[PDB]
Symmetry: D2
Subunit: 296 residues, 4 copies
């Protein structure tokens, strides 16, 4: 329990004020909100936190505040990945200083890096994490990096790696990874296939929609554990009705908007080039917020 | 059953040393599947090497399978060709032979508009003279990538009664089930069968069912009983097998296992498919032994 | 001589009932010859071979040979997914007196590179002497070859050319650099001029059926160092290709040919649909333009 | 006038991965001395995406001090963030660049409308400097349609398009729709063919070591000497084949190092060093190019 990274952890969003600057009060509120719905932990500074439109100092600011709010209450994973190895190393050292339980890094993108270069990138960050386990992050849809099973096997067996965030809808690969690494912490990355992902071999998950309905995913874990397939399917179906909507509205901004109606986030904007939510979607987003609050 | 839902094996086409149809082996394979407790057979699809067969050869297989299993298990005839006219010919034959339904892969190679794909299915349904159509979505091999809206339109065309979904996208599998509560939905990738059923599929069609169909029936049973652990363990065993078969070459590996099970006389596939690398024979023979003992 | 040159990818005219229109096929062959085409590529994608039976493809090969053998070069595309079927067509092409055979990389099923190599070897054997034109068209076949694999295919015993339907002109140059004497056909009409500059020494295309003289004009312009003329000609070809892609390539070409009094019925085989009536005015005007120009 | 052959500038670093100012100045002067028309600064080639905003500004400022008024200067100010891109655009204006450029924001999926507003916002901050839209699907993962490209290049304030695409059908279509558009060929290995299709110049990283060859291809095609154009392109590709094998940026830096222009040929991590098995070819290439011109 003290060191176990397995579980359902929300990919944290970064609330901004009207001027696009960090809204500290809302960030703290979002951390507490997640803790209150029984989340196992938080994955901070990843895609969902709009890290790639933030500076290093801004990412460190978020990491520090979240630690003050949640260190000791729930598990904390710091996504310290940048395209640059040196920048990733700086964030890794900060994560350790703030007391995070683990670090994580997306495969460096934009430039075509060889597999050997990706491996050395992880090794360097693991060195700077000084003790904190590394969570390899595979997300080809956004990074453009397509790894083979053999390459994934090599990455997850590097000294210092304790988990893999698998943001892939290939559940054959998910099963193969589980079969090859029986003890590996394996996070399902696409919320919309959570139930099937666990069945395939994942033993937990990290997702952005957990911010507004994390209890449903915890419910799926329990349902499958008790052999209640009907309940597991029903919960996944409800999650997907929500995901359908969020994808149409824009994932991060849609989530922030729902959180705004739940009195957690003051201003639901994302940073440019992300645009605002189309007004035509507000009725459904407001109704969703009302439903989720009634449910919780 | 009075419906098309279930676990159906995608039938392989046994050939002799001359690459010609081995009728005796085909009959044995049909009977072998029936004894395994399979719900039906999907004939003339990718797995039957239909695309390296002539129209008359495909028809010959349909006729023989019908002779062997009509009335015993469900029979689905894949009549799809790039040509609409050729597909219609096979559909008319399937009707004549008494098949329970027809199926057609989205026409490939040439890029066709979605409207043309729709008209293609309509024309085949017309020739099927009453037999329901099983739309076949398999982007990996066909190169045709349909959107959810397009899939919804195809499955609702008059005369369509099912969808064979050979896609690993389980978000789409769930969306299809959500939009069509009563649709017969076959999981197409054997290696994700358990997860596919959980996502919304209510059955499946697969090549590996030929050598271990009881395992998939076991997964259906396990999930229906809420025995998640048994379902997972069964899927794991199936995947250990699939890993090997993909390494050896899927169709030829399956035929080789069937050969060691005394079902297929000569385990050859038609060129350009090459033979199995002799280095894999020990593992394939051992697998056959394991499966036979498992029954 | 050799197989280098500008060859039209022949279309297969059909009648109202989707059956081969022999008279129109003959007219189209003669029409191409009169345009000054160097040869014809028969039985390929453009001839709707993949929606034809082996017997139908053979019938087309036989008729074209009767009409143009000895007048222009004739390449028979005998490719099928099946090796055995491809071999039957190769043997027929030999029997009819074609100058060479060609085969698209077998599609649909995933085949190993070794299997692709053996496929070409088997067809070459049945071609009984006719040189093989390897056919690389990843967009339609789904088969993506590496430069090393392409080099291996073009050097197989019996291979005499490569039809490169790829817009990658870096690879076009690399192929020319590795094989200085290789007959290399540019496959995408819309980049013909640039393809030749990159290293192709000729081309095979479906639009050659209605304006082959323009492509011959580009070859001449580049040969004489007239860059602007080459560019202007390519620009005109592309204005046409823009339209044809909008209307549907094969049916659009057949429709133009219909207005040129060459093809009786401009239909393609199902699942190909008919041309949208709204495009007829543009297609008719194009036919008129090309006839006046020619 | 922004039409021409301009080198995509590399950013020299020292053994500790910090900016090597002296080598940066030397590389700028080296390019000017070989007759380059201008420099494209802070793009992919400058390793901008493994640099901080302040580091990118430092490079822009130094380059301006060294070349403003002598050759054309285009500042690539593109970032995923619009605000960051605007900061660099404002700095580019302050340093006196002739134009700004921005790659389509990447990683996160953005709507076309969002891409358009991104460019408009940067153009506003460029305070007068024309914008060079940058299309490079291979690296960005953003695939634009012809209609979308047409919309982007027609936005007020856009004066050119850097087309890093091997699709020469689209290159021709773009030229057909925009007769007066400054259109830079982005893949050095198809330069000759790109110009024939419609490009009227180019921006490339290999121009740093053999820009005169590309200038030579422009001249050859203008004079109708196709043979010379092809020979030059062939020689460029023999070099490009090698550089892709060795790693493009580090290969170029290594050649420049043997030419005594760049002190340390390293790229920033995660880029690794050059495999020593390639040094014989790289040294020979440097020797060859120095003798050539």
């Amino acid at each position: 329990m003290a060191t176990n990274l397995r579980g359902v952890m929300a990919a944290l969003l970064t609330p901004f004020d009207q001027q696009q600057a960090l809204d500290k009060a809302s960030l703290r509120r979002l951390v507490q909100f997640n803790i209150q719905q029984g989340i196992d932990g938080l994955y901070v500074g990843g895609s969902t936190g709009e890290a790639f439109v933030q500076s290093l100092s801004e990412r460190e600011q978020v990491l520090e505040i979240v630690a003050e709010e949640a260190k000791g209450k729930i598990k904390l994973i710091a996504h310290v990945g940048c395209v640059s190895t040196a920048e990733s190393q700086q964030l890794a050292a900060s994560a350790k200083r703030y007391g995070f339980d683990a670090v994580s890094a997306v495969t460096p993108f934009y430039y075509p890096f060889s597999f050997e270069e990706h491996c050395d990138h992880y090794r360097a960050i693991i060195d700077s994490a000084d003790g904190l386990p590394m969570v390899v992050y595979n997300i080809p849809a956004l990074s453009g990096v397509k790894l083979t099973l053999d390459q994934i096997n090599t990455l997850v067996t590097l000294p210092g790696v304790g988990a893999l965030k698998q943001t892939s809808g290939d559940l054959y690969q998910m099963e193969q990874i589980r079969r090859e690494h029986p003890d590996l912490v394996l996070y399902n990355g696409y919320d919309e296939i959570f139930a099937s992902g666990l069945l395939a071999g994942a033993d937990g998950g990290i997702g952005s929609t957990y911010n507004i309905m994390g209890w449903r995913y915890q419910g799926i874990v329990k349902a499958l554990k008790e052999g209640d397939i009907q309940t597991a399917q029903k919960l996944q179906t409800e999650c997907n009705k929500v995901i359908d909507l969020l994808i149409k509205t824009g994932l991060f901004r849609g989530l922030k908007t729902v959180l705004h109606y739940m009195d957690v986030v003051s201003v639901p904007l994302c940073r440019k080039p992300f645009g605002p939510v189309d007004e035509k979607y507000l009725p459904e987003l407001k109704a969703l917020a009302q439903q989720l609050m009634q449910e919780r």
